[PDB]
Amino acid sequence: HMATIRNLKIKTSTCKRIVKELHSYEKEVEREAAKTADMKDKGADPYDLKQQENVLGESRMMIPDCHKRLESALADLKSTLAELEETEKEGPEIEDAKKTVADVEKQ
């Protein structure tokens, strides 16, 4: 029904946002990992290196939690799609949701 599609839109947006958050966390990891490498070949002392290794470690710890939220959002979206498939011509919102499901599953 129409309300289900409006729900679908929100759930699609939620997935897209969490993917964006995930990518942001991932980019932070990549940047922190590159900084770690730069400090190592630059001969940073063990204290500074440890500090940076902790920063990297914590950046990485953001990722699984983000995945969990993403997986939850993907389940929410898929559930709504499944509800709509129960009815059911495909328009832009279902298209967008399905595209987003595909994008999320690639993460």
- How far is 27 from 32, CA to CA, in rounded Å? 8
List phi, psi (to 5°) of 90: -80, 120
* CB neighbourhood size of 40 (10 A): 12
Query: What was the elucidation method?
Result: X-ray
Per-residue b/e over 41-77, b at no fewer than 16 CB within 10 Å? Answer: eeebeeeeeeebeeebeebeebeeebeebbeebbebb
- How far is 67 from 21, CA to CA, in rounded Å? 10
Query: What resolution, expressed in A, was reported for this entry?
Result: 1.6
Interrupted after residues, the chain (C–N over 2.5 Å): 87
Please report, for the domain that includes residue 35, its CATH number: 1.20.58.90
- How far is 88 from 55, CA to CA, in rounded Å? 49
Number of domains in the chain: 1
